[PDB]
Amino acid sequence: LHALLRDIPAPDAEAMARTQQHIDGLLKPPGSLGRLETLAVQLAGMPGLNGTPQVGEKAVLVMCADHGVWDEGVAVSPKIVTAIQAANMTRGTTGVCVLAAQAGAKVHVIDVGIDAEPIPGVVNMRVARGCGNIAVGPAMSRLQAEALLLEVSRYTCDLAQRGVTLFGVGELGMANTTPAAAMVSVFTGSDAKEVVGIGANLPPSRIDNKVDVVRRAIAINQPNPRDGIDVLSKVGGFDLVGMTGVMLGAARCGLPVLLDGFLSYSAALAACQIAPAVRPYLIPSHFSAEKGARIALAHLSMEPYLHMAMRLGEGSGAALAMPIVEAACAMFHNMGELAAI
Amino acid sequence: LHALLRDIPAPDAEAMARTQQHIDGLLKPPGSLGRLETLAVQLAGMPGLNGTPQVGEKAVLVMCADHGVWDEGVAVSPKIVTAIQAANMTRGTTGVCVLAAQAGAKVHVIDVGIDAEPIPGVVNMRVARGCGNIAVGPAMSRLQAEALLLEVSRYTCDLAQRGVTLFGVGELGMANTTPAAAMVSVFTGSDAKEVVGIGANLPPSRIDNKVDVVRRAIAINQPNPRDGIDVLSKVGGFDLVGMTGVMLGAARCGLPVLLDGFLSYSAALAACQIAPAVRPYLIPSHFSAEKGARIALAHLSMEPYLHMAMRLGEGSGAALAMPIVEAACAMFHNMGELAAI
Ligand SMILES: O=P(O)(O)OC[C@H]1O[C@H](n2cnc3nc(O)ncc32)[C@H](O)[C@@H]1O
Ligand SMILES: O=P(O)(O)OC[C@H]1O[C@H](n2cnc3nc(O)ncc32)[C@H](O)[C@@H]1O
Ligand SMILES: O=C(O)c1cccnc1
Ligand SMILES: O=C(O)c1cccnc1
Numbered sequence: 001l002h003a004l005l006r007d008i009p010a011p012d013a014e015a016m017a018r019t020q021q022h023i024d025g026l027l028k029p030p031g032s033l034g035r036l037e038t039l040a041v042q043l044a045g046m047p048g049l050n051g052t053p054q055v056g057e058k059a060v061l062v063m064c065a066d067h068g069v070w071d072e073g074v075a076v077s078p079k080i081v082t083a084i085q086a087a088n089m090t091r092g093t094t095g096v097c098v099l100a101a102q103a104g105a106k107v108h109v110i111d112v113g114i115d116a117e118p119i120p121g122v123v124n125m126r127v128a129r130g131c132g133n134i135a136v137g138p139a140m141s142r143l144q145a146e147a148l149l150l151e152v153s154r155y156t157c158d159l160a161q162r163g164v165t166l167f168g169v170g171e172l173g174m175a176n177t178t179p180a181a182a183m184v185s186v187f188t189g190s191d192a193k194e195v196v197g198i199g200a201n202l203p204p205s206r207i208d209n210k211v212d213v214v215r216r217a218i219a220i221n222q223p224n225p226r227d228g229i230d231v232l233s234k235v236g237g238f239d240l241v242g243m244t245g246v247m248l249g250a251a252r253c254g255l256p257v258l259l260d261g262f263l264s265y266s267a268a269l270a271a272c273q274i275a276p277a278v279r280p281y282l283i284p285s286h287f288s289a290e291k292g293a294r295i296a297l298a299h300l301s302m303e304p305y306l307h308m309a310m311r312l313g314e315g316s317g318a319a320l321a322m323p324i325v326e327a328a329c330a331m332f333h334n335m336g337e338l339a340a341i
Numbered sequence: 342l343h344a345l346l347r348d349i350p351a352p353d354a355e356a357m358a359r360t361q362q363h364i365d366g367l368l369k370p371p372g373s374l375g376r377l378e379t380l381a382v383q384l385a386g387m388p389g390l391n392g393t394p395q396v397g398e399k400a401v402l403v404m405c406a407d408h409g410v411w412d413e414g415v416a417v418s419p420k421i422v423t424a425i426q427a428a429n430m431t432r433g434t435t436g437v438c439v440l441a442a443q444a445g446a447k448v449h450v451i452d453v454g455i456d457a458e459p460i461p462g463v464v465n466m467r468v469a470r471g472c473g474n475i476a477v478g479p480a481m482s483r484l485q486a487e488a489l490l491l492e493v494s495r496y497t498c499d500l501a502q503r504g505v506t507l508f509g510v511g512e513l514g515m516a517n518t519t520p521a522a523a524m525v526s527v528f529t530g531s532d533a534k535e536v537v538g539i540g541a542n543l544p545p546s547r548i549d550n551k552v553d554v555v556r557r558a559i560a561i562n563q564p565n566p567r568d569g570i571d572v573l574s575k576v577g578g579f580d581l582v583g584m585t586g587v588m589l590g591a592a593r594c595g596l597p598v599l600l601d602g603f604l605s606y607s608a609a610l611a612a613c614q615i616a617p618a619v620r621p622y623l624i625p626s627h628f629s630a631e632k633g634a635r636i637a638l639a640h641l642s643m644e645p646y647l648h649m650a651m652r653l654g655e656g657s658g659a660a661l662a663m664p665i666v667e668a669a670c671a672m673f674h675n676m677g678e679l680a681a682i
Contacts, residue, residue: 027429028436029418029541033657034630034650077370084682088368093677095369102664102671200370289375305648309375316374323443323664330443336434341425 001150008251008277011045019044019053019332027336035305039283040328046281047254048160053329056165058105058322060096060315061156062089063242064122064172065113067179068133072213075175077200082174083116085314089172090121095312096170099319105168107315108159112148113238125151131237134179134217138234140241145233149245156249166325168258168285169246169267170315171239174200177290178210180266182217182235184292186225187269188299192218195292197262200311228273236270243267248274251281258318258325261288261311265296272300285321286310342491349592349618352386360385360394360673368677376646380624381669387622388595389501394670397506399446399663401437401656402497403430404583405463405513406454408520409474413554416516418541423515424457426655430513431462436653437511440660446509448656449500453489454579466492472578475520475558479575481582486574490586497590507666509599509626510587510608511656512580515541518631519551521607523558523576525633527566528610529640533559536633538603541652569614577611584608589615592622599659599666602629602652606637613641626662627651 019041024030031037043053064086070079088094089109092101100107110123115130127148131139156167177199184195192214202210221234232241244267250257259268259282271278286306287293297304305324310317360382365371372378384394405427411420429435430450433442441448451464456471468489472480497508518540525536533555543551562575573582585608591598600609600623612619627647628634638645646665651658 027434028653032541032651032653033436034652036649036651081682088677091677093368095374095672095676098671098675099668102668200373303648307644307646307648308377310377311375312369312373320668327440327443327661330439331436334439335436336429336432341422
């Protein structure tokens with residue numbers, strides 16, 4: 001794991017300089033394509049991309065897991081919805097599925113801890129049947145967190161061997177906005193009230209309880225903010241850990257990862273805490289409608305491209321942004337040159 | 342023309358209600374897809390769409406024209422760049438071209454007033470060789486403005502007959518951000534300084550002059566803000582008029598139009614002034630990096646989906662947003678239903 005982390009490559013400044021120059025020579029006023037130009041340059045510096053902005057195969061990895069904290073009344077969806085939706089993922093009827101197909105991306109459903117019988121068709125990496133209830137203790141052990149990080153990391157880089165060049169992260173887990181809020185609070189130093197949202201339509205009444213639960217989790221566990229693994233293990237969840245693992249894996253692999261919404265931001269904070277070298281590989285997608293979104297993003301210093309007021313999760317926003325990544329590549333490779341004004 | 346305007350259909354509330362209900366029944370927490378849901382409903386109310394959110398063929402219409410105001414030193418690009426770029430449009434090497442191909446949209450290049458010999462391959466609807474210099478008088482006559490509105494309007498609806506269901510608007514015209522700023526100032530009641538930007542990399546030094554030119558145009562022409570045609574004809578340009586015409590045509594046709602950037606916002610203000618019935622057919626794309634963008638958008642009460650810091654024009658932002666429109670349709674038609682949680 002420390003090996004893994006040690007080997008995350010730095011971005012290729014040489015390739016980025018060449019990219020910048022090329023972009024500057026295209027048939028348009030310099031810098032006129034704004035963020036599309038920056039994105040192209042960013043991609044060029046990613047070693048797994050072979051010195052140029054390009055997109056081969058695309059994959060969205062959905063990490064599914066249950067949380068003991070559901071027992072605290074923090075989620076309106078019944079627990080079984082995780083298991084149900086995960087099965088649905090195999091039939092292509094969910095929101096991510098539909099958006100991924102539209103982007104020509106393949107969806108990988110990964111069970112890292114659903115509290116139900118295994119689902120055929122789903123990738124099995126289950127830690128346990130739901131994680132511990134963070135309101136009364138840790139979600140899992142450090143060992144457990146590290147093992148999963150490792151396993152997902154590897155799974156991720158292996159896909160690279162198969163032509164995938166662009167990943168998207170997603171999750172599925174009733175009550176997951178709760179641990180996500182706790183992590184955000186911890187990493188950013190914000191008070192719980194500021195980052196706790198309505199999740200999947202939690203009634204406004206029910207909010208207070210959610211806030212208290214978050215505070216409780218933190219007080220009880222005393223997660224160390226300087227230790228991303230410590231935080232994940234104490235007040236995170238298997239799904240969150242899994243997302244962090246995709247990020248570490250893609251970075252080690254020298255490839256880009258598209259973030260999704262709120263849950264993904266929490267995982268990104270942990271990943272960057274654990275390995276700052278991860279940062280350059282992350283690409284924001286959309287601006288989640290979850291309350292703590294702004295705070296979370298400010299800490300990652302990211303400005304999403306899409307303002308859609310989305311709050312579904314599943315990696316749906318990631319899929320929706322894929323065409324943008326492809327657009328930056330198209331611009332780079334297909335535009336004519338000034339020299340030929 | 343008044344006929345044309347009179348016949349713009351109202352949105353189909355019946356179809357929209359059915360759409361809303363269907364969306365609500367999809368396999369996700371209600372309202373979880375935010376703006377994608379709203380967009381789908383909007384599309385459903387458009388009569389040319391046959392009661393459902395759908396996308397058939399896509400077209401981006403680029404209106405090209407020269408402006409006499411270029412003589413005032415308000416643009417750094419040489420005048421010929423309009424003619425050059427317009428030819429380039431026929432070869433698929435420009436920014437819009439590349440982005441449109443990526444979206445599976447076809448680009449229609451329309452010459453409404455380039456100050457050069459006709460370009461083979463370009464649609465000929467030329468009013469004159471560049472419009473009058475707004476700093477010393479009107480851009481054109483009212484008659485001229487109305488005629489062009491009519492002609493473009495018709496051209497637009499005719500494309501509908503050929504399977505196009507979604508339009509994008511764009512332009513090409515050195516110095517065009519100048520008349521665009523004047524229109525914005527006029528319609529919104531903002532002072533020139535607040536809405537005059539750098540256009541295609543105008544040096545910061547050169548700004549003052551640009552502001553004065555705008556003020557001059559207005560003082561001299563005294564455009565009536567309550568009369569959109571009056572404004573267009575006095576302080577607009579052939580390209581701007583042409584964009585307004587696509588908007589009027591698509592609306593009459595009962596079809597959606599994707600806006601682009603700053604120039605497009607100015608044209609939209611005029612269109613809505615002329616015919617408020619046009620409003621429901623307009624769809625924002627991106628948030629232009631031009632200074633007066635925010636003001637312009639506030640007046641249209643539109644919040645763009647994409648924050649890319651783009652400022653190229655040509656209809657490039659419109660093309661980039663097409664996949665989003667298609668995503669809303671995919672969501673609508675392909676997601677599974679709750680009833681089948
Ligand atoms: O913390 P809560 O309020 O439960 O919200 C987080 C969950 O809701 C999101 N979520 C995604 N697809 C969903 N499908 C259903 O049916 N419910 C929630 C869904 C997210 O992915 C988590 O599973
Ligand atoms: O008012 P200015 O500073 O001239 O900016 C508006 C123009 O610049 C934009 N524009 C688009 N493609 C371009 N290609 C070149 O080469 N220059 C400007 C271009 C816009 O479409 C207008 O033609
Ligand atoms: O931003 C998200 O991804 C999100 C917000 C609420 C519920 N589920 C997911
Ligand atoms: O917003 C635009 O479309 C734009 C801004 C500057 C120059 N050309 C186009």
